[PDB]
Ligand binder design. Structure first.
Ligand SMILES: Nc1ncnc2c1ncn2[C@@H]1O[C@@H]2COP(=O)(O)O[C@H]2[C@H]1O
Lengths: 1041, 159, 76, 71, 159, 80
């Protein structure tokens, strides 16, 4: 009968009661947990059954307390961190945590020695300072995350807390070994080796096990429990093997492991990711509750029997001196900490000083001091002082840090946040009123008590010099609410320009969030884009500049130089000889009785002298030249016998390990180029959307023209920069574009699965099976080759949209092509030359310049389609920016190919479909901009459409109700009203009943229609050989009874 | 009252599901069924089943008044909160609200739903004076409510 | 567009709207006529419609500061 | 349709589409019965079979059963 | 016999109703609900088995069935977390039990085993399968006359 | 199988003997009180309780009486 189950479950119940009853009170639940632990301890001191339970649990071993509770707390502190904002300010957090912890521990040790009447030496006082310096603020981080801005202050506090806890336990272990458990003497070299071993091989062991855990988690599909148990066992095994077997700091190993696992969250499935977040949060809550209950019981049972009024006075002076020492530390490191990318103000310094909440880590270290000290009074004084400092810091610092965040002005809600929240609350209230008016006239839910319904459905506003600022912001908007005609003033013009810039930046932020939520952007690209947007909005009347965005896709650094050097270094037999290399390696580890069986028969006669040097390299480089050096040293074949194997193994394994380093460098460049491509695509799509919605927002034409000009210059610069980024690293760009294409197709297939599930056509289990299939495909896409080689120019002709499936047409076009090589020619297409053929771009970035449309098209885009199809002089001049290789299929060959292949969907039809999609995207994007359509949604809606064959219509077309949008592509059309034939290509107005195309000089005007999307679904199978490939063939969904 | 509330909630959900399913399948039966005689027979049996289930649900309302009022109030609050959550997701996905504020509003509506879960299961029926106040064609105009309530006539027809 | 109770003439005026039913989307214009007093109602549902500029006001105790005029239709 | 949309994109145009079509290849999980399916296909002379005729009482019973199943 | 076979499920029912009532009034903290479920399970089993001297296994059976019955008193995110969390806890328990069983079988149980014991193991497996089939066949006349009767294929699969 | 391999390794090697001695030679009551509530609660909680209670009489009579008569038959088989 284990009493530990009673104490653990009772502590869980007491923690639940403490969390439930103290929701509204500012006192944390840990303080009343300590109070309940003290009450349970004095009850156990009176009653013997509670004495039995708390004796079996609260008087625990110190090492089992550390090995159980420290990995959970340290791993959750590392795993709950936002690692991107942590690594962006890693230098400041690192210098503050490390050096401030060292100097605060030294100052607390000096304070303890000079003030405390107990005759502690410097090692026990340094242990006291190491316990006191460890801060665990969670309420401060929660308040900083909740109270709007200063998120970077919260990440600074959390990262400094994590590194401070790790280094505090490290120096605590060092001085605890100096005081209590050994007392062994050592030389200076052993001390240097011990310091190097701890402070280096802690993080190195954590890094190694973290890389092994990430590699194991990447190759696990469709079993969550394996991933969760891999994470838990990796954490506990890392801490145990580091602390016990390797005799290294296991706390830093779990810090590094948690930071790396939180960094590579893409190797975990998202459902397993949110489960791991909530599970480690629950585990840390369990560990904190157990630690606080045990601390309260042992404080009121053992630590409170030796305490005087002088000890209480020392506790008060210790609290005051600890706060003063932390403030002095932050003030002295403030000149260093100001000159980083995120400097500290005085308000952030005050919040960080008052945010030093002592937590469960210092309580656990005081518990292991008190259990290690035995019957000596030092452990009792340690435990009493640590418990008192924890109680005082928790109560006073939590309540006064809520009050201080209110006082200092860091808790006020910002004006755009208040505007957005008020607009959201108004929209929710209008929707609730419409839903209430719909439900009041229902068949069933009509006699409900609507007073109770309106009382319950009453979601309200959470937020319930500034007056002059709002007066300026309201006088800057003489809009639709005030219909007064006037003329602008230069002060009024400056105010209108500032307001237009603010509206453009706000709408760009809206476009970035719209890109993120539907999903084109990543999280970090979205954060960078909104950071640049708010930085441009705050300062100096400037828009979002191209340089700060350009800092994202600047790929240069250590990694491209390493890639170039390794690719200069390089230029089943090899697998077999590598297996032989490792099979030689393990004898060296065994060598370093019968003299070890004659040194395993002279290493199996040097493995029959490396299998006669792999049959002389199967009867055969400079790599082989130093292999011949190893060969002649083996021909010499006791120091030389030991040295030869060790010199053989690494020199032979270098050839194997170089391309793995090439793959690692390619992966790092792949990650950086993925971030740069995501930032560039997000800016381009946001600028396109904000240019399509700028006519409504901006009223003045001069400001409209200026904003459009600066937006289009920024868009063209970013497009050209991304084209040059593609030209820089070809294989890595091909790999990231392949990854993004596979991810987009799989996301749209998942959307199709959810659509067919929600329409009822598929049941829940089969939809779950298909979702499992696409999730397995996504996770296998996550671990992909990051250096996919570029396709040949012959393969780029096969995968175009206007010839994809027709193999005979592919053979014809490939047989009669012409691969040209233009080098800065700028004579591809002129403004008024006759059509002479197409130009399929297979390499380089062209520059379009014509009527003023400017664009930089790239590989895959076809040039000359309009001129070849319409038999007209060309539209725009196309130049070359970087050595463009076109595929010049001539006009006569194109006419022969059009006349020849027509039994299929015709080549003329495919070319007209491609140019109809290309000419029909901006019209639909211009019409349906305000309804909330992105460019990708418009393109996918256009892709469902088909060109109308006018042979059956005989130049008379009717607009039915099934057609959603009609776009005339090339020419004119009359109608039943026949007011005027439409001169230019544009979307047909939906009010027009019919279209009357006319026969003219030969153009034959193509019209593009998109019909709206359309439960019996009767299908026919057929049995085949072996009676296993029985499959439905004729899915119809259009039958008779 | 809670046990009868659970059983009556299940019965109301089954009846509403059958009625809405019959309405939808009657609206989509002209395309699926081609023969007019079979179409007329299927429409006749569908409308007889729909009318019988509607009359049975009305008599079920007439049997236990307070419990039916409580389950209809619960379903109305749940429907309004679900449409408000859909509005929150729409405002979030359109970019007009950031992720933290949308999370706060989702926390508010989830707390409201879980407090709706533990509700009085025997909510008393409203008075006939209160049913005149909460109609759709006079909701907010207090003077019009006073006029209609002053010049009304409550009749007591019995079959 | 749904005409609720009455008739209306088209711009083409081929045949006036005989029954209360869904008015077709192809029709450009409607010419409702004055007759014996019905005044035929037509029901229209317009499609739904990012600046959202609003004005607050400070009140007593400086805690009830709230936006009043949410407009989303302004000038520069 | 998504592949044809992405092949004409501004950015994702030079990707290796053979690897993309190989990876995005979600397939069918399921890869007296013959006579039963023959009856179930002779009971449906629909839009794919444009032959005008008149109903038979056996055909009327089959149409009634098929209409009940579709309902 | 009365104490065990009655006060097992009664104690499980009482603690299950207390746990459901506690879970119904918890808003916007998942960890409280998860720890309430875990501590309720462990305290139910321990107090029933040790303090009340009753069958704690039936108490946890009744408590789990009631908590799974009233899943509406738990928030849905906490509900799916509790499903995956108890699944991984049972996976941990099964893995630990099988590893410990293998170690103690090959350390202690494998030192006293004969060819007669292996023959007894084979005959025991055959007789266990035959006995389960005979049990299902003899209770098949009773089990057929319920709302879901057993066919011969279902009986073979259950055997 | 891996437990058997680890057990014979522990029967040979003393460090694995230390680890498996401290764990695998556990108390019976702590083994029951730790592992039985988790398994029993997950078996009860993973059940679909509506379909379980719809066929509760059949499951109850089969489990109870078949367990009693199968335990009696297995006891008689073991004795004989
Ligand atoms: N506004 C545009 N959008 C897309 N492509 C264009 C545009 N303008 C010109 N082009 C391309 O540039 C080519 C130049 O000559 P063409 O007119 O024969 O065919 C043209 C198109 O392929």
């Amino acid at each position: 009968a284990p009493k530990v189950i009673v104490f653990i479950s009772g502590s869980c119940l007491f923690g639940a009661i403490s969390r439930s009853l103290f929701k509204k009170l500012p006192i944390p639940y840990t303080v009343v947990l300590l109070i309940l632990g003290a009450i349970l301890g004095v009850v156990a001191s009176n009653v013997p059954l509670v004495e039995e339970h708390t004796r079996d649990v609260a008087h625990m071993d110190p090492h089992v307390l550390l090995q159980i509770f420290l990995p959970v707390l340290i791993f959750e502190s590392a795993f709950a961190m936002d690692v991107h904002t942590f690594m962006r300010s890693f230098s400041q957090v690192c210098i503050l945590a490390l050096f401030g912890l060292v100097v605060a521990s030294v100052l607390t040790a000096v304070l303890a020695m000079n003030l405390f009447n107990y005759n502690w030496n410097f090692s026990e006082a340094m242990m006291f300072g190491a316990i006191m310096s460890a801060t665990d603020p969670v309420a401060v981080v929660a308040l900083l995350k909740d109270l709007g801005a200063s998120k970077q202050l919260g990440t600074i506090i959390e990262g400094e807390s994590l590194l401070n806890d790790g280094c505090a336990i490290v120096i605590f272990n060092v001085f605890m070994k100096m005081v209590f458990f050994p007392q062994l003497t050592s030389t200076v070299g052993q001390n240097v080796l011990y310091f190097l071993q701890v402070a280096v091989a802690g993080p190195l062991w954590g890094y190694a096990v973290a890389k092994v855990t990430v590699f194991f988690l990447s190759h696990i599909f469709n079993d969550a429990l394996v991933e969760i148990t891999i994470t838990l066992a990796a954490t506990y095994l890392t801490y145990y093997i580091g602390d016990i077997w390797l005799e290294v700091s296991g706390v830093l190993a779990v810090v590094v492991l948690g930071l790396i696992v939180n960094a590579e969250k893409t190797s975990i499935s998202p459902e397993v990711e949110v489960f791991l977040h909530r599970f480690w949060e629950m585990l840390a809550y369990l560990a904190n509750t157990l630690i606080f209950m045990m601390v309260g019981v042992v404080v009121t049972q053992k630590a409170l029997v030796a305490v005087d009024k002088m000890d209480w006075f020392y506790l008060i002076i210790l609290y005051l001196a600890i706060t003063i020492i932390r403030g002095m530390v932050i003030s002295l490191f403030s000149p260093i900490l100001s000159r980083i990318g995120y400097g500290l103000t005085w308000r952030n310094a005050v919040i960080m000083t008052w945010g030093g909440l002592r937590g469960a880590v210092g309580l656990a270290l005081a518990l292991v001091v008190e259990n290690l000290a035995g019957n000596d009074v030092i452990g009792s004084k340690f435990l009493f002082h640590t418990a008192g400092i924890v109680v005082l810091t928790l109560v006073i610092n939590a309540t006064t840090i809520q009050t201080l965040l209110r006082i200092l002005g860091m808790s006020d809600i910002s004006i755009p946040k208040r505007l957005a929240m008020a607009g959201a609350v108004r929209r929710i209230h209008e929707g609730q009123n419409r839903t209430l008016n719909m439900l009041k006239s229902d068949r069933f839910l009509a006699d409900a008590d609507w007073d109770i319904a309106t009382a319950a459905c009453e979601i309200s506003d959470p937020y319930s010099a500034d007056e002059l600022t709002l007066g300026e912001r309201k006088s800057v908007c003489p809009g639709c609410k005030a219909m007064v005609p006037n003329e602008p003033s230069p002060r009024e013009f400056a105010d209108m320009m500032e307001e237009a810039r603010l509206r453009m930046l706000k709408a760009e932020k809206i476009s970035y969030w719209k890109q993120f939520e539907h999903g084109m952007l990543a999280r970090e690209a979205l954060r960078l884009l909104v950071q640049h947007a708010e930085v441009a909005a705050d300062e100096k009347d400037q828009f979002i500049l191209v340089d700060d965005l350009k800092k994202s896709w600047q790929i240069k650094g250590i990694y491209p130089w390493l890639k170039r050097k390794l690719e200069d270094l390089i230029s089943a037999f090899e697998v077999t000889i590598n297996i032989a290399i490792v099979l030689n390696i393990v004898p060296i580890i065994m060598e370093f009785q019968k003299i070890e069986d004659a040194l395993r028969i002279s290493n199996y006669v040097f493995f029959v002298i490396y299998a006669i040097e792999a049959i002389v390299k199967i009867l055969g480089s400079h790599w082989n030249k130093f292999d011949a050096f190893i060969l002649v040293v083996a021909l010499v074949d006791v120091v030389k016998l030991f040295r030869l194997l060790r010199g053989l193994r690494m020199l032979r394994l270098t050839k194997a390990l170089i391309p793995k380093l090439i793959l690692v460098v390619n992966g790092k460049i792949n990650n950086q180029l993925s971030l740069g491509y995501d930032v560039g695509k997000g800016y381009i799509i946001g600028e396109e959307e904000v240019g399509k919605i700028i006519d409504r927002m901006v009223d003045n034409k001069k400001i409209l023209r200026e904003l459009k000009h600066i937006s289009e210059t920024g868009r063209l610069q970013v497009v050209k920069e991304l084209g040059l980024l593609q030209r820089e690293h070809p294989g890595i760009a091909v790999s990231v574009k392949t990854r993004q294409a596979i991810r987009t197709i799989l996301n749209h297939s998942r959307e199709t699965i959810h659509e067919l599930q929600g329409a009822g056509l598929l049941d829940e289990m089969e939809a779950h099976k298909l979702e499992l299939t696409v999730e397995i495909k996504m996770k296998r896409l996550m671990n992909a080759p990051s250096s996919i080689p570029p396709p040949p120019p012959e393969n780029l002709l096969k995968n175009v949209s206007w010839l994809a499936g027709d193999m005979k047409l592919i053979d014809f076009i490939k047989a009669r092509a012409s691969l040209l090589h233009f080098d800065y020619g700028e004579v591809i297409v002129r403004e008024g030359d006759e059509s002479d053929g197409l130009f399929l771009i297979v390499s380089g970035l062209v520059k379009l310049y014509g009527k003023v449309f400017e664009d930089y098209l790239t590989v895959g885009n076809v040039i000359g389609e309009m001129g070849v199809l319409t038999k007209k002089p060309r539209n725009a001049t196309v130049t070359c920016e970087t050595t463009v290789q076109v595929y010049f299929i001539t006009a006569e060959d194109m006419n022969i190919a059009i006349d020849t292949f027509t039994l299929y969907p015709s080549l003329e039809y495919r070319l007209w479909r491609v140019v109809a999609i290309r000419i029909a995207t901006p019209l639909i994007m211009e019409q349906m901009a305000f309804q909330g359509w992105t460019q990708e949604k418009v393109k996918l809606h256009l892709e469902r459409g088909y060109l109308v064959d006018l042979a059956e219509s005989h130049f008379q077309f009717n607009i039915d109700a099934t057609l959603e949008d009609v776009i005339l592509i090339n020419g004119t059309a009359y109608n039943a009203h026949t007011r005027e034939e439409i001169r230019s290509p544009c979307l047909i107005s939906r009010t027009v009943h019919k279209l009357t195309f006319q026969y003219t000089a030969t153009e034959e005007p193509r019209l593009f229609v998109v019909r709206n999307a359309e439960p019996i679904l009767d299908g026919r199978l057929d049995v085949d050989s072996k009676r296993s490939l029985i499959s439905i063939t004729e899915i119809s969904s259009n039958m008779c009874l």
